[PDB]
RNA sequence: GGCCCGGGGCGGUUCGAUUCCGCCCUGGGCCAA
């Protein structure tokens, strides 16, 4: 149980055993041939080509090089044609552009079309850059593949490995650049402990400096940030995670944390114990991809949080869960019920013009003076958080994201109490309240 | 689809709004795939 002792056993969870590496080779072999018999210009990229794939995430990425002069349209049509005749099973996926996804000899395969180019400039879509990235990486990551694997396992185990919007963590390309830079997993970890929210890592210049944000400059483009979508808190959890590992290394850092489910009865008690208001917003899940969905959930949650805090309900944290069935926006406030009356700041006493207007407004309670200015008692339209969120949600649906909002407008309900405990959100709430044990 | 910056119009709220809550047009930048 010192770092070395532990990393020895970690390799055993991140590195693909012989039957997984093999099964991959036979795929590539066969996948190679099919392409050759159709005489197609391709190039394997991604972690498979660079043997940097994590044990159990075997996925081959085949990019088809196309003449610079071809139209995007030709690229997809011929790409669709090629992916089609070369895949046991084929399925049309989408991202910046449409591409084919399939399976060969039992393994995942992506068949992406892109332009054959030289010089990063003239890249028309992120996918054009992929070839350069791989080109810049192949010679430099050689002999450190397992260091990359250890770093991917770590991030994966602590729920921050992907860069898609559902994670906002460290992309795979970010992982290898880090190794190229620090030489190994441990060095990366040891140095990360001194990372701040202002750290900039210029792989190309082999330098580390201070910027205006966490920035890992792409060796292939000096203006692009590889860790651009790494959220601030996710960067925080990592720095802290390295700090801990280094203080007491454990094989537990590479093992996914167990769900740790709680009986609802217990959950209720804690909420009773916390004395806070806990409720969730339930609406149907828009039939869209996670990359559009999650950023919307974040928006919705945020807009409602801010409605709650400006409306003096003292919210503590927000959260959200997504299912096949519905989406849950969760909340916790310090105020279960506020008074109807509240005070409104009026003009200063010596402004006759405004004082008069401020008084022309007939009110139920008759304003008063305090510290040189007039004030007024006013009544609220709602006195509980839920009551407030039913109002805000019913009228502000349009500001909660294009999709999420359109779904909320057509349906939603506010759940709380026991009826809430039983919904598919128990885990999220435990994280939102730091329930421990 | 989401985030950043900027223009032109509006609505509501307020003694008072460029300034708070929001809506329509609209220019550029960026992110995930």
Swiss-Prot record:
It catalyses: a tRNA precursor + 2 CTP + ATP = a tRNA with a 3' CCA end + 3 diphosphate; a tRNA with a 3' CCA end + 2 CTP + ATP = a tRNA with a 3' CCACCA end + 3 diphosphate. Mg(2+) binds at residues 59, 61, 110. GO terms for molecular function: ATP binding; CCA tRNA nucleotidyltransferase activity; CCACCA tRNA nucleotidyltransferase activity; magnesium ion binding; tRNA binding. ATP binds at residues 47, 50, 133, 152, 161. CTP binds at residues 47, 50, 133, 152, 161. Changing residue 133 to A: No decrease in both AMP and CMP incorporation. Gene3D superfamilies: Archaeal tRNA CCA-adding enzyme catalytic domain (3.30.70.1550), Beta Polymerase, domain 2 (3.30.460.10), CCA tRNA nucleotidyltransferase, domain 2 (1.10.1410.30), Poly(A) polymerase predicted RNA binding domain (3.30.70.590). Its cofactor is Mg(2+). Changing residue 50 to A: High decrease in both AMP and CMP incorporation. Keywords: ATP-binding, Magnesium, Metal-binding, Nucleotide-binding, Nucleotidyltransferase, RNA repair, RNA-binding, Transferase, tRNA processing. Pfam families: CAA_C, NTP_transf_2, tRNA_NucTransf2. Its EC number is 2.7.7.72. Transmembrane segments: none annotated. InterPro entries: CAA_C (IPR048833), CCA-adding_arc (IPR008229), CCA_tRNA_nucleotrans_2 (IPR042090), NT_2-5OAS_ClassI-CCAase (IPR006116), NT_sf (IPR043519), NuclTrfase_I-like_C (IPR011068), Polymerase_NTP_transf_dom (IPR002934), tRNA_NucTransf2 (IPR015329). GO terms for biological process: RNA repair; tRNA 3'-terminal CCA addition; tRNA surveillance. Catalyzes the addition and repair of the essential 3'-terminal CCA sequence in tRNAs without using a nucleic acid template. Adds these three nucleotides in the order of C, C, and A to the tRNA nucleotide-73, using CTP and ATP as substrates and producing inorganic pyrophosphate. tRNA 3'-terminal CCA addition is required both for tRNA processing and repair. Also involved in tRNA surveillance by mediating tandem CCA addition to generate a CCACCA at the 3' terminus of unstable tRNAs. While stable tRNAs receive only 3'-terminal CCA, unstable tRNAs are marked with CCACCA and rapidly degraded. PANTHER family: CCA-ADDING ENZYME. Belongs to the tRNA nucleotidyltransferase/poly(A) polymerase family. Archaeal CCA-adding enzyme subfamily. A single active site specifically recognizes both ATP and CTP and is responsible for their addition. In contrast to the eubacterial homologs, the specificity of the nucleotide-binding pocket is determined by both the enzyme and the tRNA. Homodimer. This is CCA-adding enzyme. It comes from Archaeoglobus fulgidus (strain ATCC 49558 / DSM 4304 / JCM 9628 / NBRC 100126 / VC-16). The lineage of its organism: Archaea, Methanobacteriati, Methanobacteriota, Archaeoglobi, Archaeoglobales. The gene is cca.
